[PDB]
Amino acid sequence: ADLEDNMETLNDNLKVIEKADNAAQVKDALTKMAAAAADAWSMHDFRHGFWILIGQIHDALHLANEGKVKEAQHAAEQLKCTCNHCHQAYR
Amino acid sequence: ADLEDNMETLNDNLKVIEKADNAAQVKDALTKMAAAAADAWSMHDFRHGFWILIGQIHDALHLANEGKVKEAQHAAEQLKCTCNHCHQAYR
Amino acid sequence: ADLEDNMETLNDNLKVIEKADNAAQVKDALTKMAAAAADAWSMHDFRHGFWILIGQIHDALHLANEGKVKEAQHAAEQLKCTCNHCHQAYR
Amino acid sequence: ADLEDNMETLNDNLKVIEKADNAAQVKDALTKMAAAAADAWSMHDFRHGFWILIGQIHDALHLANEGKVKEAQHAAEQLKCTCNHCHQAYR
Ligand code: HEC
Ligand code: HEC
Ligand code: HEC
Ligand code: HEC
Ligand SMILES: [Ca+2]
Ligand SMILES: [Ca+2]
Ligand SMILES: [Ca+2]
Ligand SMILES: [Ca+2]
Ligand SMILES: [Ca+2]
Ligand SMILES: [Ca+2]
Ligand SMILES: [Ca+2]
Ligand SMILES: [Ca+2]
Ligand SMILES: [Ca+2]
Ligand SMILES: [Ca+2]
Ligand SMILES: [Ca+2]
Ligand SMILES: [Ca+2]
Ligand SMILES: [Ca+2]
Ligand SMILES: [Ca+2]
Ligand SMILES: [Ca+2]
Ligand SMILES: [Ca+2]
Ligand SMILES: [Ca+2]
Ligand SMILES: [Ca+2]
Ligand SMILES: [Zn+2]
Ligand SMILES: [Zn+2]
Ligand SMILES: [Zn+2]
Ligand SMILES: [Zn+2]
Ligand SMILES: [Zn+2]
Ligand SMILES: [Zn+2]
Ligand SMILES: [Zn+2]
Ligand SMILES: [Zn+2]
Secondary structure (H helix, E strand, C coil), X not given: CCHHHHHHHHHHHHHHHHCCCCHHHHHHXXXXXXXXXXXXXXXXXXXXXXXXXXXXXXXXXXXXXXXXXXXXXXXXXXXXXXXXXXHHHCC | CCHHHHHXXXXXXXXXXXXXXXXXXXXXXXXXXXXXXXXXXXXXCHHHHHHHHHHHHHHHHHXXXXXXXXXXXXXXXXXXXXXXXXXXXXX | CCHHHHHHHHHHHHHHHHCCCCHHHHHHHHHHXXXXXXXXXXXXXXXXXHHHHHHHHHHXXXXXXXXXXXXXXXXXXXXXXXHHHHHHHCC | CCHHHHHHHHHHHHHHHHCCCCHHHXXXXXXXXXXXXXHHCCCCCHHHHHHHHHHHHHXXXXXXXXXXXXXXXXXXXHCHHHHHHHHHHCC
C-alpha cells in the first residue's frame, strides 16, 4: 500500500524479533515483514532492493519453523545492511 | 599474526575507506583488510567467517579498480553485518 | 497445477530460449517458466528447490529486459544444475 | 602452471569424485582440483571464473570433511555449469 507505512511495519517488527523469546513470536513478526516488502515491491534497481529483502526474510522463516530462535534472530540483523544500502543510495 | 591486531587493521582501514576521496585510497585500504582477514584465517564455523569476509572484500576491489568509488564505499558498509554476526555469536 | 505438466513447460521453453534470436522470444519463454515453477511451488527441501529456480529465472528476465540476449541465454543454461540436483536427489 | 594441464586435472578428478566410494577419495580429489584452479588463477572476467570455481570447491570440502559423501558428490556436479559458462563465452 503506502511506502511510509511499509517502512513502519518493517522497523517495528524487527524490534519485536530482537525482543522475542520463543519461535512463534519470531515466526509471526517475519510474516508481517515479508508482506510489507512484497507490498512495497510495486530506476529499479530500487525495486530489486525489495526482491533481495524478500529472499533474506524467507530464509529466516525456515530457521524459525525449525525452532532455531537464536539463528533466526541473527539472520534478522543481517537484513539491516540491505535496509542501509537503499537509504545510503536513494536518500 | 595476532588476532587483536588483525581486528585493529580491519576497523581502522574501514574508516579510511569511509573518509576516502579517490579510488587509490579505497583500493589500498581494502588490500590491507584482505591481508588481515587471510592472516586471521588460521569450531570453524569461526574460520568460515573469515572466508566470507575475504570474498566480500575481493568483490569490492573490482569496484575500486574500475573507478567506482561510491559503490566501493557502499560495498564496504555491507561487510559490517559479517563483523557483527561473529561478535553476536562468539562473544 | 499438475507436476508432470509443469516439467513439460520448463523443458520445452528452455529449448525455445536456446533457439531464440531476439529478446522478445527469450523474455516470453522465461515468463512461462517462472509461472510453471511458482505453480509447482505447492520434505521440502523439495519445495525450496523451486524457490531457487524462481530466483534464477527472475535474474534472467532483467538481462532479457535490458536487451542482453546472449547473457540471458547463458543464464538459462545455469538453471540446468538446479534441475539435475533435484533429479539426482529425489529419483 | 600450464592451462591445458590444469583442465586435465579438473576433468580427470571430477570423474574420480563421481566414482568415489568413501570420503577420503572425494576429499583428496577436490584438493587437487582446488590447486589446479588457484594455479590457473594467474579480460578477467575470465579470471573471476576461476575465483567462483575455487569457492564452490571449497564448500564441497566441508561436506567431505563432515563425512557427507553423497552431498559432496552432488556439489561437484553443480561445478559443471561454471565450467560450461566459460567455454560457451570464451570459445
Ligand atoms: C529493512 C529492514 C528496512 C527498514 C527497517 C527500513 N527500511 Fe526504508 N526507506 C526507503 C526510502 C526511500 C525511505 C524514504 C521514504 C519514506 O520516508 O518512506 C525509507 C524510509 C525508512 C524509514 C523512515 C520512514 C519515516 O517514517 O519517515 C524507516 C524507519 C525505514 N525506512 C526502515 C527505502 C528502502 C529500501 C529501498 C530499496 C529498502 C530495502 C528499505 N528502505 C529497507 C528498510
Ligand atoms: C569486520 C569488518 C570486522 C571488524 C571491523 C572487527 N571485527 Fe572482530 N572480533 C572477533 C572476536 C572473537 C573478537 C574478540 C577477540 C579480540 O579481542 O580480538 C573481535 C574483536 C574485535 C574488536 C575489538 C578488539 C579489541 O581491541 O579489543 C574489533 C574492533 C573488531 N573485532 C573489529 C571475531 C570476528 C570475526 C569472526 C568470525 C569476524 C568476521 C570479525 N571479528 C570481523 C570484524
Ligand atoms: C529445470 C529447468 C527443470 C527441467 C527442465 C525439468 N525439471 Fe524436473 N522433475 C522433478 C521430479 C520429482 C520429476 C519426476 C516426477 C515427474 O515425472 O513429473 C521430474 C521430472 C522431470 C521431467 C520428466 C517428466 C516426464 O514427462 O516424465 C522433465 C522433462 C523435467 N523434470 C524437466 C523434480 C524437479 C525439481 C525438484 C526440486 C526441480 C527443481 C526440477 N525438477 C527442475 C526441472
Ligand atoms: C570445471 C570443472 C572445468 C572442467 C572440467 C574443464 N574446464 Fe575448461 N577450458 C577453458 C578454456 C579457455 C579452454 C580452452 C583452452 C585449452 O584448450 O586449454 C578450456 C578447455 C578445457 C578442456 C579441453 C582441454 C584440451 O585438452 O583441449 C577441458 C577438458 C576442460 N576445459 C575442462 C576455460 C575454462 C574456464 C574459464 C573461466 C573455466 C572456469 C573452466 N574452463 C572450467 C573447466
Ligand atoms: Ca512515519
Ligand atoms: Ca504507523
Ligand atoms: Ca505512518
Ligand atoms: Ca521479551
Ligand atoms: Ca531469491
Ligand atoms: Ca586493542
Ligand atoms: Ca595497534
Ligand atoms: Ca594492539
Ligand atoms: Ca577525506
Ligand atoms: Ca509427459
Ligand atoms: Ca504436454
Ligand atoms: Ca503431459
Ligand atoms: Ca531460431
Ligand atoms: Ca590435452
Ligand atoms: Ca595430461
Ligand atoms: Ca596435456
Ligand atoms: Ca568406485
Ligand atoms: Ca568466495
Ligand atoms: Zn528484481
Ligand atoms: Zn549465527
Ligand atoms: Zn570455509
Ligand atoms: Zn550502491
Ligand atoms: Zn524455501
Ligand atoms: Zn556469460
Ligand atoms: Zn575476481
Ligand atoms: Zn543434494
